[PDB]
Amino acid sequence: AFLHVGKMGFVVTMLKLIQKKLLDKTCDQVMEFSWSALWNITDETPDNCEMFLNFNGMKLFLDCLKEFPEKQELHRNMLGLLGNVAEVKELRPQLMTSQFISVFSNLLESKADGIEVSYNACGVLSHIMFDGPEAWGVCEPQREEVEERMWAAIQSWDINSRRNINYRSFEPILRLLPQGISPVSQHWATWALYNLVSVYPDKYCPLLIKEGGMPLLRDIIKMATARQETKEMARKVIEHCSNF
Amino acid sequence: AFLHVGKMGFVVTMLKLIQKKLLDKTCDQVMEFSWSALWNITDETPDNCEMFLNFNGMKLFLDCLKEFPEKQELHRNMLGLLGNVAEVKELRPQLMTSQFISVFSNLLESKADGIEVSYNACGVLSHIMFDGPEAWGVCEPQREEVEERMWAAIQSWDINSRRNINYRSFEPILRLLPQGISPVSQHWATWALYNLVSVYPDKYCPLLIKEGGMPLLRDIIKMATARQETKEMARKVIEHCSNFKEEN
Protein backbone atom coordinates (compact mmCIF):
# COMPACT_ATOMS: atom_id res chain seq x y z
CA ALA A 1 0.00 0.00 0.00
CA PHE A 2 0.92 3.68 -0.04
CA LEU A 3 -0.55 7.00 1.06
CA HIS A 4 -3.45 8.71 -0.72
CA VAL A 5 -1.58 10.49 -3.53
CA GLY A 6 -4.42 12.90 -4.32
CA LYS A 7 -5.13 14.00 -0.74
CA MET A 8 -1.43 14.35 0.04
CA GLY A 9 -0.63 16.19 -3.19
CA PHE A 10 2.19 13.72 -3.78
CA VAL A 11 2.53 14.47 -7.51
CA VAL A 12 3.29 18.10 -6.63
CA THR A 13 5.69 16.98 -3.89
CA MET A 14 7.69 14.96 -6.42
CA LEU A 15 7.74 17.71 -9.04
CA LYS A 16 8.94 20.27 -6.49
CA LEU A 17 11.79 17.96 -5.54
CA ILE A 18 12.67 17.37 -9.19
CA GLN A 19 12.75 21.14 -9.70
CA LYS A 20 15.14 21.55 -6.76
CA LYS A 21 17.45 18.80 -8.02
CA LEU A 22 17.44 20.24 -11.53
CA LEU A 23 18.47 23.68 -10.24
CA ASP A 24 21.36 22.09 -8.31
CA LYS A 25 22.22 20.18 -11.53
CA THR A 26 22.13 16.87 -9.63
CA CYS A 27 20.76 13.61 -11.03
CA ASP A 28 21.33 11.42 -7.99
CA GLN A 29 19.31 8.53 -6.53
CA VAL A 30 16.71 10.93 -5.12
CA MET A 31 16.17 12.58 -8.51
CA GLU A 32 15.72 9.20 -10.17
CA PHE A 33 13.38 7.99 -7.42
CA SER A 34 11.15 11.03 -7.87
CA TRP A 35 10.63 10.25 -11.54
CA SER A 36 10.27 6.52 -10.82
CA ALA A 37 7.56 7.39 -8.29
CA LEU A 38 5.73 9.54 -10.85
CA TRP A 39 5.87 6.71 -13.41
CA ASN A 40 4.45 4.25 -10.90
CA ILE A 41 1.68 6.50 -9.53
CA THR A 42 0.44 7.39 -13.02
CA ASP A 43 -0.13 3.74 -14.05
CA GLU A 44 -3.78 3.54 -15.07
CA THR A 45 -4.39 6.72 -13.03
CA PRO A 46 -5.49 9.61 -15.28
CA ASP A 47 -5.98 12.11 -12.46
CA ASN A 48 -2.29 11.84 -11.57
CA CYS A 49 -1.30 12.18 -15.25
CA GLU A 50 -3.48 15.28 -15.41
CA MET A 51 -1.88 16.76 -12.29
CA PHE A 52 1.60 16.18 -13.73
CA LEU A 53 0.64 18.18 -16.82
CA ASN A 54 -1.14 20.93 -14.90
CA PHE A 55 1.87 21.49 -12.62
CA ASN A 56 4.05 22.20 -15.70
CA GLY A 57 5.60 18.73 -15.64
CA MET A 58 6.36 18.81 -19.36
CA LYS A 59 8.79 21.70 -18.87
CA LEU A 60 10.62 19.80 -16.12
CA PHE A 61 10.79 16.73 -18.36
CA LEU A 62 12.34 18.68 -21.23
CA ASP A 63 14.74 20.53 -18.94
CA CYS A 64 15.85 17.28 -17.30
CA LEU A 65 16.42 15.69 -20.72
CA LYS A 66 18.73 18.54 -21.70
CA GLU A 67 20.59 18.89 -18.41
CA PHE A 68 21.14 15.10 -18.04
CA PRO A 69 21.48 13.77 -21.61
CA GLU A 70 23.38 10.60 -20.68
CA LYS A 71 21.42 9.55 -17.55
CA GLN A 72 19.80 6.38 -18.89
CA GLU A 73 17.60 5.36 -15.94
CA LEU A 74 16.34 8.92 -15.57
CA HIS A 75 15.33 8.86 -19.26
CA ARG A 76 13.59 5.50 -18.81
CA ASN A 77 11.56 6.73 -15.86
CA MET A 78 10.56 10.00 -17.51
CA LEU A 79 9.43 8.23 -20.67
CA GLY A 80 7.53 5.62 -18.67
CA LEU A 81 5.63 8.45 -17.03
CA LEU A 82 4.86 10.01 -20.40
CA GLY A 83 3.73 6.62 -21.66
CA ASN A 84 1.06 6.66 -18.96
CA VAL A 85 0.04 10.24 -19.82
CA ALA A 86 -0.30 9.27 -23.49
CA GLU A 87 -2.81 6.52 -22.68
CA VAL A 88 -5.33 9.21 -21.61
CA LYS A 89 -7.18 10.30 -24.75
CA GLU A 90 -8.42 13.53 -23.13
CA LEU A 91 -4.82 14.61 -22.33
CA ARG A 92 -3.17 13.71 -25.66
CA PRO A 93 -3.96 17.08 -27.31
CA GLN A 94 -1.52 18.62 -24.84
CA LEU A 95 1.23 16.46 -26.35
CA MET A 96 0.52 17.74 -29.90
CA THR A 97 3.17 20.44 -30.19
CA SER A 98 6.20 20.61 -32.44
CA GLN A 99 8.39 20.90 -29.34
CA PHE A 100 7.05 17.70 -27.78
CA ILE A 101 6.59 15.64 -30.95
CA SER A 102 10.19 16.45 -31.96
CA VAL A 103 11.47 15.12 -28.63
CA PHE A 104 9.46 11.88 -28.85
CA SER A 105 10.49 11.34 -32.47
CA ASN A 106 14.15 11.98 -31.61
CA LEU A 107 14.00 9.51 -28.70
CA LEU A 108 12.98 6.73 -31.12
CA GLU A 109 16.72 6.38 -31.80
CA SER A 110 17.77 6.38 -28.14
CA LYS A 111 19.93 3.50 -26.95
CA ALA A 112 19.35 4.37 -23.28
CA ASP A 113 18.46 1.51 -20.90
CA GLY A 114 18.56 -1.06 -23.68
CA ILE A 115 15.36 -0.42 -25.63
CA GLU A 116 13.22 1.13 -22.91
CA VAL A 117 13.48 4.78 -23.93
CA SER A 118 12.86 4.06 -27.61
CA TYR A 119 10.02 1.67 -26.73
CA ASN A 120 8.27 4.11 -24.40
CA ALA A 121 8.67 6.96 -26.89
CA CYS A 122 7.17 4.72 -29.59
CA GLY A 123 4.29 3.91 -27.26
CA VAL A 124 3.61 7.60 -26.69
CA LEU A 125 3.58 8.20 -30.43
CA SER A 126 1.49 5.07 -31.06
CA HIS A 127 -1.35 6.44 -28.92
CA ILE A 128 -0.91 9.86 -30.54
CA MET A 129 -1.09 8.36 -34.03
CA PHE A 130 -4.19 6.32 -33.12
CA ASP A 131 -6.21 9.56 -32.97
CA GLY A 132 -5.77 9.99 -36.76
CA PRO A 133 -4.29 12.60 -39.09
CA GLU A 134 -6.84 15.27 -38.13
CA ALA A 135 -5.40 15.24 -34.60
CA TRP A 136 -1.91 16.01 -35.97
CA GLY A 137 -2.11 19.76 -36.39
CA VAL A 138 1.67 20.00 -36.07
CA CYS A 139 3.62 21.19 -39.12
CA GLU A 140 7.22 20.24 -38.22
CA PRO A 141 8.15 16.65 -37.80
CA GLN A 142 5.70 15.61 -40.50
CA ARG A 143 3.46 12.73 -39.46
CA GLU A 144 4.74 10.46 -42.24
CA GLU A 145 8.37 11.06 -41.23
CA VAL A 146 7.69 10.21 -37.60
CA GLU A 147 5.77 7.13 -38.76
CA GLU A 148 8.72 5.86 -40.78
CA ARG A 149 11.01 6.43 -37.76
CA MET A 150 8.61 4.35 -35.63
CA TRP A 151 8.76 1.44 -38.07
CA ALA A 152 12.56 1.72 -38.06
CA ALA A 153 12.72 1.70 -34.27
CA ILE A 154 10.43 -1.30 -33.85
CA GLN A 155 12.35 -3.38 -36.38
CA SER A 156 15.66 -2.51 -34.69
CA TRP A 157 14.71 -3.93 -31.29
CA ASP A 158 15.80 -7.41 -30.31
CA ILE A 159 12.62 -9.44 -29.89
CA ASN A 160 14.27 -11.36 -27.03
CA SER A 161 15.15 -8.21 -25.09
CA ARG A 162 14.85 -8.53 -21.35
CA ARG A 163 12.74 -5.64 -20.11
CA ASN A 164 12.55 -3.00 -17.40
CA ILE A 165 8.79 -2.52 -17.58
CA ASN A 166 5.69 -4.28 -16.28
CA TYR A 167 1.98 -4.26 -17.06
CA ARG A 168 -0.92 -4.98 -14.71
CA SER A 169 -3.25 -5.11 -17.71
CA PHE A 170 -2.71 -5.16 -21.47
CA GLU A 171 -5.94 -3.25 -22.15
CA PRO A 172 -4.28 0.03 -23.35
CA ILE A 173 -2.14 -2.01 -25.76
CA LEU A 174 -4.99 -4.24 -26.94
CA ARG A 175 -6.98 -1.12 -27.83
CA LEU A 176 -4.42 -0.47 -30.61
CA LEU A 177 -5.12 -3.85 -32.24
CA PRO A 178 -8.69 -3.62 -33.67
CA GLN A 179 -8.18 -0.51 -35.78
CA GLY A 180 -6.98 0.57 -39.20
CA ILE A 181 -6.44 4.25 -38.42
CA SER A 182 -2.76 3.66 -37.59
CA PRO A 183 -1.06 0.45 -38.77
CA VAL A 184 2.18 1.59 -37.11
CA SER A 185 0.45 1.79 -33.70
CA GLN A 186 -0.99 -1.68 -34.28
CA HIS A 187 2.50 -2.93 -35.15
CA TRP A 188 4.01 -1.38 -32.02
CA ALA A 189 1.30 -3.00 -29.91
CA THR A 190 1.80 -6.39 -31.56
CA TRP A 191 5.56 -6.14 -30.99
CA ALA A 192 4.97 -5.25 -27.33
CA LEU A 193 2.93 -8.42 -26.80
CA TYR A 194 5.31 -10.59 -28.84
CA ASN A 195 8.34 -9.51 -26.82
CA LEU A 196 6.59 -10.05 -23.48
CA VAL A 197 5.16 -13.50 -24.26
CA SER A 198 8.49 -14.49 -25.83
CA VAL A 199 10.68 -13.54 -22.86
CA TYR A 200 8.20 -13.79 -19.94
CA PRO A 201 5.54 -16.29 -21.05
CA ASP A 202 4.58 -17.51 -17.57
CA LYS A 203 3.51 -14.00 -16.55
CA TYR A 204 2.24 -12.56 -19.81
CA CYS A 205 0.67 -15.44 -21.75
CA PRO A 206 -2.08 -15.93 -19.10
CA LEU A 207 -2.58 -12.15 -18.99
CA LEU A 208 -2.95 -11.84 -22.77
CA ILE A 209 -5.38 -14.79 -22.91
CA LYS A 210 -7.61 -13.66 -20.03
CA GLU A 211 -8.02 -10.17 -21.49
CA GLY A 212 -9.17 -11.36 -24.92
CA GLY A 213 -5.95 -10.94 -26.90
CA MET A 214 -6.32 -14.09 -28.96
CA PRO A 215 -9.42 -13.13 -31.02
CA LEU A 216 -7.91 -9.67 -31.48
CA LEU A 217 -4.71 -11.14 -32.93
CA ARG A 218 -6.61 -13.55 -35.19
CA ASP A 219 -8.57 -10.59 -36.57
CA ILE A 220 -5.28 -8.86 -37.41
CA ILE A 221 -4.35 -11.73 -39.73
CA LYS A 222 -7.62 -11.16 -41.65
CA MET A 223 -7.40 -7.35 -41.62
CA ALA A 224 -6.93 -5.51 -44.93
CA THR A 225 -5.20 -2.54 -43.24
CA ALA A 226 -2.62 -4.61 -41.34
CA ARG A 227 0.86 -4.94 -42.80
CA GLN A 228 2.28 -8.34 -43.75
CA GLU A 229 4.89 -8.04 -41.00
CA THR A 230 2.21 -7.39 -38.38
CA LYS A 231 0.23 -10.42 -39.53
CA GLU A 232 3.37 -12.57 -39.31
CA MET A 233 4.14 -11.29 -35.83
CA ALA A 234 0.55 -11.81 -34.65
CA ARG A 235 0.49 -15.44 -35.77
CA LYS A 236 3.63 -16.07 -33.69
CA VAL A 237 2.06 -14.43 -30.63
CA ILE A 238 -0.88 -16.84 -30.97
CA GLU A 239 1.74 -19.57 -31.42
CA HIS A 240 3.38 -19.00 -28.03
CA CYS A 241 0.06 -18.57 -26.25
CA SER A 242 -1.37 -21.82 -27.63
CA ASN A 243 1.71 -23.73 -26.45
CA PHE A 244 0.93 -22.26 -23.01
CA ALA B 1 2.78 0.54 -17.13
CA PHE B 2 5.02 0.56 -14.09
CA LEU B 3 8.29 -0.76 -12.70
CA HIS B 4 8.40 -2.25 -9.17
CA VAL B 5 11.97 -3.38 -8.72
CA GLY B 6 14.35 -3.51 -5.81
CA LYS B 7 16.94 -0.76 -5.72
CA MET B 8 19.64 -1.49 -3.16
CA GLY B 9 21.37 1.87 -3.58
CA PHE B 10 18.21 3.84 -2.96
CA VAL B 11 17.09 1.88 0.13
CA VAL B 12 20.61 2.42 1.44
CA THR B 13 20.55 6.12 0.56
CA MET B 14 17.19 6.59 2.29
CA LEU B 15 18.26 4.76 5.45
CA LYS B 16 21.42 6.87 5.59
CA LEU B 17 19.43 10.11 5.37
CA ILE B 18 17.10 8.92 8.15
CA GLN B 19 20.08 8.04 10.35
CA LYS B 20 21.55 11.49 9.64
CA LYS B 21 18.31 13.29 10.52
CA LEU B 22 18.00 11.07 13.60
CA LEU B 23 21.42 12.20 14.84
CA ASP B 24 20.44 15.80 14.11
CA LYS B 25 17.24 15.26 16.17
CA THR B 26 15.33 16.92 13.31
CA CYS B 27 12.23 15.36 11.80
CA ASP B 28 11.92 17.81 8.90
CA GLN B 29 10.52 17.40 5.40
CA VAL B 30 13.55 15.34 4.40
CA MET B 31 12.91 12.88 7.26
CA GLU B 32 9.27 12.55 6.16
CA PHE B 33 10.32 12.30 2.51
CA SER B 34 12.72 9.45 3.25
CA TRP B 35 10.23 7.30 5.14
CA SER B 36 7.46 8.03 2.64
CA ALA B 37 9.89 7.13 -0.15
CA LEU B 38 10.54 3.79 1.59
CA TRP B 39 6.75 3.34 1.90
CA ASN B 40 6.41 4.02 -1.83
CA ILE B 41 9.16 1.70 -3.04
CA THR B 42 8.06 -1.20 -0.81
CA ASP B 43 4.49 -1.06 -2.20
CA GLU B 44 4.06 -4.44 -3.95
CA THR B 45 7.89 -4.74 -3.93
CA PRO B 46 9.19 -7.40 -1.50
CA ASP B 47 12.82 -6.92 -2.56
CA ASN B 48 12.93 -3.41 -1.11
CA CYS B 49 11.37 -4.72 2.11
CA GLU B 50 14.13 -7.30 2.38
CA MET B 51 16.81 -4.66 1.79
CA PHE B 52 15.23 -2.37 4.44
CA LEU B 53 15.64 -5.12 7.05
CA ASN B 54 19.13 -6.17 5.89
CA PHE B 55 20.41 -2.59 6.30
CA ASN B 56 19.26 -2.09 9.89
CA GLY B 57 15.81 -0.63 9.18
CA MET B 58 14.16 -1.99 12.32
CA LYS B 59 16.63 -0.21 14.63
CA LEU B 60 16.11 3.07 12.75
CA PHE B 61 12.34 2.59 13.11
CA LEU B 62 12.52 2.08 16.87
CA ASP B 63 14.91 5.01 17.32
CA CYS B 64 12.75 7.36 15.30
CA LEU B 65 9.73 6.30 17.35
CA LYS B 66 11.61 6.98 20.60
CA GLU B 67 13.12 10.27 19.41
CA PHE B 68 9.90 11.64 17.86
CA PRO B 69 7.01 10.28 19.96
CA GLU B 70 4.42 12.91 18.98
CA LYS B 71 5.09 13.31 15.22
CA GLN B 72 1.96 11.77 13.73
CA GLU B 73 2.97 12.14 10.07
CA LEU B 74 6.25 10.32 10.71
CA HIS B 75 4.43 7.53 12.52
CA ARG B 76 2.01 7.19 9.62
CA ASN B 77 4.86 6.93 7.11
CA MET B 78 6.86 4.46 9.23
CA LEU B 79 3.89 2.21 9.94
CA GLY B 80 2.90 2.39 6.29
CA LEU B 81 6.34 1.09 5.41
CA LEU B 82 6.20 -1.63 8.07
CA GLY B 83 2.78 -2.65 6.78
CA ASN B 84 4.41 -3.36 3.43
CA VAL B 85 7.32 -5.24 5.07
CA ALA B 86 4.95 -7.45 7.04
CA GLU B 87 3.22 -8.64 3.86
CA VAL B 88 6.36 -10.61 2.97
CA LYS B 89 6.08 -14.06 4.57
CA GLU B 90 9.82 -14.77 4.41
CA LEU B 91 10.58 -11.52 6.27
CA ARG B 92 8.13 -11.92 9.16
CA PRO B 93 10.53 -14.09 11.26
CA GLN B 94 12.69 -10.97 11.70
CA LEU B 95 9.76 -9.19 13.36
CA MET B 96 9.32 -11.88 16.04
CA THR B 97 10.94 -10.30 19.08
CA SER B 98 9.25 -9.12 22.28
CA GLN B 99 10.68 -5.66 21.56
CA PHE B 100 8.94 -5.36 18.18
CA ILE B 101 5.69 -7.10 19.16
CA SER B 102 5.29 -4.83 22.19
CA VAL B 103 5.85 -1.71 20.05
CA PHE B 104 3.31 -2.85 17.45
CA SER B 105 0.72 -3.89 20.05
CA ASN B 106 1.10 -0.55 21.84
CA LEU B 107 0.34 1.26 18.57
CA LEU B 108 -3.06 -0.44 18.28
CA GLU B 109 -4.54 2.33 20.41
CA SER B 110 -2.78 5.15 18.49
CA LYS B 111 -4.83 8.13 17.32
CA ALA B 112 -2.11 9.36 14.92
CA ASP B 113 -3.39 10.45 11.47
CA GLY B 114 -6.99 9.38 12.01
CA ILE B 115 -6.81 5.59 12.18
CA GLU B 116 -3.80 5.07 9.93
CA VAL B 117 -1.19 4.15 12.56
CA SER B 118 -3.56 1.84 14.48
CA TYR B 119 -4.80 0.32 11.21
CA ASN B 120 -1.31 -0.39 9.88
CA ALA B 121 -0.11 -1.76 13.23
CA CYS B 122 -3.13 -4.04 13.19
CA GLY B 123 -2.27 -5.08 9.63
CA VAL B 124 1.32 -5.89 10.60
CA LEU B 125 0.01 -7.97 13.51
CA SER B 126 -2.65 -9.61 11.31
CA HIS B 127 -0.01 -10.96 8.95
CA ILE B 128 2.05 -12.06 11.96
CA MET B 129 -0.94 -13.84 13.52
CA PHE B 130 -1.62 -15.67 10.24
CA ASP B 131 1.74 -17.44 10.75
CA GLY B 132 0.36 -19.29 13.77
CA PRO B 133 1.36 -19.78 17.40
CA GLU B 134 4.65 -21.61 16.75
CA ALA B 135 6.05 -18.52 14.99
CA TRP B 136 5.25 -16.44 18.10
CA GLY B 137 7.40 -18.61 20.33
CA VAL B 138 8.00 -17.02 23.72
CA CYS B 139 7.54 -13.43 22.50
CA GLU B 140 5.83 -11.01 24.91
CA PRO B 141 3.15 -9.81 25.34
CA GLN B 142 1.20 -13.06 25.06
CA ARG B 143 -0.40 -13.84 21.72
CA GLU B 144 -3.92 -13.99 23.18
CA GLU B 145 -3.57 -10.56 24.78
CA VAL B 146 -2.50 -9.03 21.48
CA GLU B 147 -5.38 -10.74 19.70
CA GLU B 148 -7.83 -9.17 22.14
CA ARG B 149 -6.32 -5.72 21.64
CA MET B 150 -6.57 -6.19 17.86
CA TRP B 151 -10.28 -7.07 18.08
CA ALA B 152 -10.84 -3.99 20.23
CA ALA B 153 -8.94 -1.69 17.87
CA ILE B 154 -10.88 -2.91 14.83
CA GLN B 155 -14.22 -2.39 16.55
CA SER B 156 -13.13 1.12 17.64
CA TRP B 157 -12.65 2.44 14.09
CA ASP B 158 -15.45 4.29 12.34
CA ILE B 159 -16.47 2.12 9.40
CA ASN B 160 -16.93 5.34 7.39
CA SER B 161 -13.49 6.73 8.28
CA ARG B 162 -11.86 8.83 5.61
CA ARG B 163 -8.51 7.31 4.70
CA ASN B 164 -4.94 8.24 3.89
CA ILE B 165 -4.17 5.00 2.07
CA ASN B 166 -4.22 3.59 -1.46
CA TYR B 167 -4.18 -0.03 -2.61
CA ARG B 168 -3.24 -0.95 -6.17
CA SER B 169 -4.01 -4.60 -5.45
CA PHE B 170 -5.92 -6.26 -2.65
CA GLU B 171 -3.81 -9.45 -2.95
CA PRO B 172 -2.25 -9.25 0.57
CA ILE B 173 -5.63 -8.53 2.15
CA LEU B 174 -7.42 -11.29 0.23
CA ARG B 175 -4.71 -13.70 1.39
CA LEU B 176 -6.16 -13.35 4.91
CA LEU B 177 -9.70 -14.41 3.94
CA PRO B 178 -9.48 -18.17 3.08
CA GLN B 179 -7.77 -19.28 6.26
CA GLY B 180 -8.85 -20.47 9.67
CA ILE B 181 -5.52 -20.02 11.47
CA SER B 182 -6.30 -16.49 12.65
CA PRO B 183 -9.90 -15.28 13.01
CA VAL B 184 -8.69 -11.82 14.03
CA SER B 185 -6.64 -11.50 10.83
CA GLN B 186 -9.67 -12.50 8.76
CA HIS B 187 -11.71 -9.86 10.63
CA TRP B 188 -9.10 -7.14 10.02
CA ALA B 189 -9.01 -7.98 6.31
CA THR B 190 -12.80 -7.99 5.99
CA TRP B 191 -12.94 -4.64 7.80
CA ALA B 192 -10.29 -3.23 5.46
CA LEU B 193 -12.45 -4.11 2.46
CA TYR B 194 -15.70 -2.96 4.10
CA ASN B 195 -14.27 0.48 4.91
CA LEU B 196 -12.84 1.01 1.43
CA VAL B 197 -15.94 -0.12 -0.47
CA SER B 198 -18.11 1.95 1.87
CA VAL B 199 -16.16 5.17 1.45
CA TYR B 200 -14.58 4.80 -2.01
CA PRO B 201 -16.81 2.37 -3.96
CA ASP B 202 -15.95 3.77 -7.40
CA LYS B 203 -12.32 2.78 -6.86
CA TYR B 204 -12.51 -0.29 -4.67
CA CYS B 205 -15.63 -2.18 -5.76
CA PRO B 206 -14.14 -2.77 -9.26
CA LEU B 207 -10.76 -3.77 -7.80
CA LEU B 208 -12.27 -6.23 -5.33
CA ILE B 209 -14.52 -7.74 -8.00
CA LYS B 210 -11.76 -8.09 -10.58
CA GLU B 211 -9.38 -9.69 -8.06
CA GLY B 212 -11.78 -12.46 -7.08
CA GLY B 213 -12.88 -11.05 -3.75
CA MET B 214 -16.53 -12.03 -4.13
CA PRO B 215 -16.08 -15.84 -3.95
CA LEU B 216 -13.73 -15.38 -0.99
CA LEU B 217 -16.28 -13.32 0.95
CA ARG B 218 -19.13 -15.65 -0.02
CA ASP B 219 -17.05 -18.52 1.38
CA ILE B 220 -16.63 -16.80 4.76
CA ILE B 221 -20.41 -16.51 5.10
CA LYS B 222 -20.82 -20.23 4.33
CA MET B 223 -18.03 -21.38 6.68
CA ALA B 224 -19.47 -22.99 9.82
CA THR B 225 -16.49 -21.93 11.96
CA ALA B 226 -16.31 -18.25 10.95
CA ARG B 227 -17.28 -15.60 13.50
CA GLN B 228 -20.75 -14.14 12.92
CA GLU B 229 -19.42 -10.59 13.22
CA THR B 230 -17.00 -11.30 10.36
CA LYS B 231 -19.71 -13.02 8.29
CA GLU B 232 -21.93 -9.95 8.64
CA MET B 233 -19.14 -7.62 7.54
CA ALA B 234 -18.43 -9.89 4.58
CA ARG B 235 -22.11 -9.83 3.66
CA LYS B 236 -22.14 -6.04 3.78
CA VAL B 237 -19.16 -5.98 1.41
CA ILE B 238 -20.97 -8.29 -1.01
CA GLU B 239 -24.10 -6.16 -0.72
CA HIS B 240 -22.16 -2.94 -1.44
CA CYS B 241 -20.42 -4.48 -4.46
CA SER B 242 -23.60 -6.03 -5.87
CA ASN B 243 -25.21 -2.60 -5.52
CA PHE B 244 -22.22 -1.07 -7.31
CA LYS B 245 -22.75 -3.11 -10.48
CA GLU B 246 -26.39 -1.92 -10.48
CA GLU B 247 -25.59 1.81 -10.59
CA ASN B 248 -23.28 0.88 -13.49
Author numbering:
A (entry chain A): 514 to 757
B (entry chain D): 514 to 761
Sentences from the paper on this structure:
To understand the molecular basis of ZER1/ZYG11B-mediated binding of non-Gly Nt-residue peptides, we determined the crystal structures of ZER1 bound to either SFLH-, AFLH- or TFLH-peptide, as well as the crystal structures of ZYG11B bound to either SFLH-, AFLH- or CFLH- peptide. In line with our SPOT-array results, ZER1 binds to XFLHVGQD peptides in which X is either Ser (KD of 1.3), Ala (KD of 1.6), Thr (KD of 3.1) or Cys (KD of 3.9) more potently than to the Gly-starting peptide (KD of 4.2). Structural comparisons indicated that the peptide-binding modes of ZER1 and ZYG11B are similar. In this cavity, the main chains of the first three residues of the bound peptides are coordinated by a set of conserved hydrogen bonds. The free α-amino group of the Nt-residue forms hydrogen bonds with the side chains of Asp556 and Asn597 in ZER1 (the counterparts of Asp 526 and Asn 567 in ZYG11B), respectively. Furthermore, the carbonyl oxygen of the Nt-residue is stabilized by two hydrogen bonds from Asn597 and Trp552 in ZER1 (Asp 567 and Trp522 in ZYG11B). The main-chain amide and carbonyl of the second residue (F2) on the peptide hydrogen bond to the main-chain respective carbonyl and amide of Asn679 in ZER1 (Ala647 in ZYG11B). Besides, a strong π-π interaction was formed between the aromatic side chain of F2 and the indole ring of Trp 552 in ZER1 (Trp 522 in ZYG11B), this observation is consistent with our SPOT-array results that ZER1 and ZYG11B prefer an aromatic residue at position 2. The main-chain amide of the third residue on the peptide is anchored by a hydrogen bond with Asn553 in ZER1 (Asn523 in ZYG11B). Our ITC assays indicated that any alanine mutation of W552, D556, N597 or E600 in ZER1, which would disrupt the direct hydrogen bonds with Nt-residue, abolished the binding to the XFLHVGQD (X = Ser, Ala, Cys or Thr) peptides, highlighting the key role of these hydrogen bonds in mediating Nt-residue recognition.
